[PDB]
Design a protein around this ligand. Sequence first.
Ligand SMILES: Nc1ccn([C@H]2C[C@H](O)[C@@H](COP(=O)(O)NP(=O)(O)OP(=O)(O)O)O2)c(=O)n1
Ligand SMILES: [Cl-]
Ligand SMILES: [Mg+2]
Ligand SMILES: [Mg+2]
Ligand code: NA
Length: 329
Amino acid sequence: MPAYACQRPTPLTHHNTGLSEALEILAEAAGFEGSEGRLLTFCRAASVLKALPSPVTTLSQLQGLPHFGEHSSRVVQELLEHGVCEEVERVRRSERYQTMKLFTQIFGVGVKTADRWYREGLRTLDDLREQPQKLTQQQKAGLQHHQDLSTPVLRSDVDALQQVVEEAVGQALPGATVTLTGGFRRGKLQGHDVDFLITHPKEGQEAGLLPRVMCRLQDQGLILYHQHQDAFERSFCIFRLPQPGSWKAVRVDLVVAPVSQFPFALLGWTGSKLFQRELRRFSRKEKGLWLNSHGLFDPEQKTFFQAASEEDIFRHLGLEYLPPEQRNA
DNA sequence: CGGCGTACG
DNA sequence: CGTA
DNA sequence: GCCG
Ligand SMILES: Nc1ccn([C@H]2C[C@H](O)[C@@H](COP(=O)(O)NP(=O)(O)OP(=O)(O)O)O2)c(=O)n1
Ligand SMILES: [Cl-]
Ligand SMILES: [Mg+2]
Ligand SMILES: [Mg+2]
Ligand code: NA
């Protein structure tokens, strides 16, 4: 078992679901306290179990696995012995965990904001609604739409949504393309949002595209919220999605990249989040190369690596290729 | 012990 | 600060 | 919390 998540296949469904879920509770709780290192270790340990070929049934099967030390091993031991880990259950039922989870789930609210509200004594969404002077426009939209946004987006919703985006993109710039990325490209059947990557085959033609796309979607009445409703290349919006007799709000992310950068953007936006952090960590720490969603930089030669495909990027990093379905770290 | 991803709005 |  |  290699130490970095980008060195091993991780399928969407696996053989240690309950164990990984428990470790991810502790990871999440660590993040709510600002303990990024502990969050990373618990996420990495959970991800190791996702990559195993069979269920862990005995503690000895953790020997030699990376990211399993005294703490994560004890969590697994208690789940194996008793079906429950007391530390995990104590986190689950704690007022702090429950409220931080509720607040950080709101679009426009991060850990720092949720923590400040928590320290001020706030506990429920209705607490926030009662004092709306203290909310940003983004947070007001996130709170108004929170119920719909807490409902999973279904893969069966995505194709109709992509067709609507494609129509607007084609008017904004004929020949521009829309690619489904994010969790759905990794095979997920549900998501918290839909992520779309937009480019154009002629380098430079994508300059200035996203404002034109957003204006056209807004003109069609489809945008319930966006930040520009001034150059930009990423948009985090709330979209009107049809439903029988009605509609529901859904989160949609749009990102534009020049075609020279498209493999890097596709890799980055396909995730998972942990896979990408691990890939960038591997690149820098093991290969001395700096990776982001725009490119891959050699800081000694002061040169960027041209990539025509995701396959190119894995090759330039000395990693076996993983299709998106195996990036579910 | 230091390090823990790296961007854009 | 928020967001991917 | 764990790795190197
Ligand atoms: N902090 C982050 C957030 C996202 N990302 C990348 C990898 C993610 O898969 C991709 C899309 O982000 P996302 O929409 O928040 N999550 P994802 O689509 O994987 O699953 P959902 O939660 O949307 O169902 O952006 C990242 O690299 N760092
Ligand atoms: Cl980036
Ligand atoms: Mg997504
Ligand atoms: Mg997204
Ligand atoms: Na949030």
